[PDB]
Structure 1
């Protein structure tokens, strides 16, 4: 079988050996020729020039990307690169996997981890478990915030449960806060539960302000999505103990297993397309000639990328570019400032550790 090039890009320390181990158990129509690449930087230029150099020095059919940062921008950079070059990119760990709402129309970028809408519903399930029916929402303008608010609103307005959405705050973190605008907005909060949609960096500032006006102590419980907790080994000091987060940052699904599944997805999808059309998309020889060769390129390979099953496991992606059925882990920031497993979301069912929340 012919070989297709797959670049696996790793940012930050990682056991390359352990990663090469979890991986040629392919008897498909095509076999992967993978290439581990180390990267030290995660700025726009570094990421672009690196992937472009790979694409020009070799024939890359797809990219598997993983980083150890809390930088959600990385996902947005990858989507741009993916759409422009029409190359499949899987963000499987780190900032690369942090929700990227409204991917490009031509994007072939897929992320491991929950969609925004799924996290929103997981949160409502948590609140239902403990009969926390009265709450407010705080988001920034971070892309996806509308999907988050809409999802919540759609769910609670279509249920006979006595949900009471008191307030929805929209914080503008693109301007400075010298006029104490965000402080004045937060002072409006009264709910005992607060859902916060934003980035990790934004959360640390918002919590600092929220603390100053006494909204983080006892009586107030904040619930944030995966990307706010991000790397759970890095816990900002402004984060309030008692913070609850839906998470997917490498609890039961290790990096090695992810890299192996990433390679599988890309390889299977190419095999499936080859077996049906007798051709696969030719690897782009460069990024610097995409404007010419666009009538000759297409995101055709997407329809196969989203429907792969491997070793009897459904690795399907949504058309929005998210994982379909991720086993989510509910985590709590405890007294020792450590993130702590306190529930699991599996088979569209919530299984919490505690019946009554112990004191944090």
Structure 2
């Protein structure tokens, strides 16, 4: 049997480098290019590709740093009960609290694992004293609680000084944020927010003298984002946790995302059927189920499984340092660090 799979590619993409089945179904892949990334564009393109070929799944890659894409895909996925894999760019920026009916999964570590790593980098170089700074970006609570529950377990004698919550949904005329930042004493600051948010926070921090020697910021994957795009406001010496395009390229990912969806075999081989792709986005719900998820989650190819939360169980993480020459440099692997004495940055 044949199942249709749309691979959507936003912006620059080597479509030639991108292009088997012993399984019970065969992927009829179609490589689709999309120009814009606003809600209408993404919704309009996916719905129409569905009111054409019968799409059993979507594999989605963009170049942009727009973490909103993930949110737009979760919504589209939950509304049409179509599996969607966010494998690269904004679509892979971890989405916290995906919809219950969501069939959206992303390549990348959970917020909780990224926090687990950061404390590991910390233990490595004996950085036991710190602060946290989040905005309200979803997952901020996931982040803080994982840090807080880890410390309490520990005899390592951590000391969390301040935890700040920055409301980035208002303007900064009162210079409220400047004042919240002025409260920070600690030498290590863990920051959780979006890339575009971080660029603002850093500027305000460079103004209050918190970005030089003696203040080290550690930042999750979605802040670093695309490493070939470095905002001038990022403090030299920025430590991030990225999802490496260095050992796991787009074509590898895109192949693996088709191996995930081509799930369908498992469910066919056990229930002698697969869900009929939403002929349209103009609906008739007592008919569609969530059944495919159970299978999209346990795919073993050459262990590609997920959590029901929608993130990879076993992602390879590279620790990166933004250096003086202002390129992102690989200084660790997830924990094995290049350095034994942390260099002055």
TM-score higher than 0.5: yes
Q: Deviations over 1:315-356 (max 9, x none)?
A: 0001100000101000000001100000000xxxx0000011
Partners of 2:213 and 2:344 within 8 A in 1 = no
Q: Deviations over 1:201-230 (max 9, x none)?
A: 000000000010000001000000000000
Secondary structure, in 3 states, of the residue corresponding to 2:253? helix
Question: Structure 1 length as normaliser, TM-score?
Answer: 0.95
Secondary structure, in 3 states, of the residue corresponding to 2:63? coil
Secondary structure, in 3 states, of the residue corresponding to 1:57? coil
Partners of 1:230 and 1:249 within 8 A in 2 = no
Partners of 1:231 and 1:249 within 8 A in 2 = no
Q: Which runs of 5+ in 2 are unaligned?
A: none
Q: 1:47 Cα deviation (Å)?
A: 0.1
Is 1:153 paired with 2:148? yes
Q: 1:249 Cα deviation (Å)?
A: 4.2
Match of 2:78 in 1: 83
Q: 2: CA distance between counterparts of 1:168 and 1:5?
A: 48
Q: Deviations over 1:112-168 (max 9, x none)?
A: 000000000000000000000000000000000000000000001111111000000
Over the aligned positions, Cα root-mean-square deviation in angstroms equals: 0.6
Q: 1:359 Cα deviation (Å)?
A: 2.5
Partners of 2:244 and 2:316 within 8 A in 1 = no
Partners of 1:112 and 1:323 within 8 A in 2 = yes
Secondary structure, in 3 states, of the residue corresponding to 1:287? coil
Q: 1: CA distance between counterparts of 2:21 and 2:65?
A: 33
Partners of 2:106 and 2:312 within 8 A in 1 = yes
Q: Which runs of 5+ in 1 are unaligned?
A: none
Secondary structure, in 3 states, of the residue corresponding to 2:7? strand
Match of 1:74 in 2: 69
Partners of 1:76 and 1:100 within 8 A in 2 = yes
Which stretches of structure 1, 4 residues or more, deviate above 4 A after TM superposition? none
Q: 2: CA distance between counterparts of 1:249 and 1:358?
A: 22
The alignment of Structure 1 onto Structure 2 pairs a total of residues equal to 345
Q: 2: CA distance between counterparts of 1:352 and 1:151?
A: 22
Partners of 2:127 and 2:188 within 8 A in 1 = yes
Q: Deviations over 1:283-310 (max 9, x none)?
A: 1100112xxx211101110000000000
Q: 1: CA distance between counterparts of 2:219 and 2:247?
A: 20
Partners of 1:52 and 1:287 within 8 A in 2 = yes
Q: 2: CA distance between counterparts of 1:26 and 1:174?
A: 49
Partners of 1:9 and 1:36 within 8 A in 2 = yes
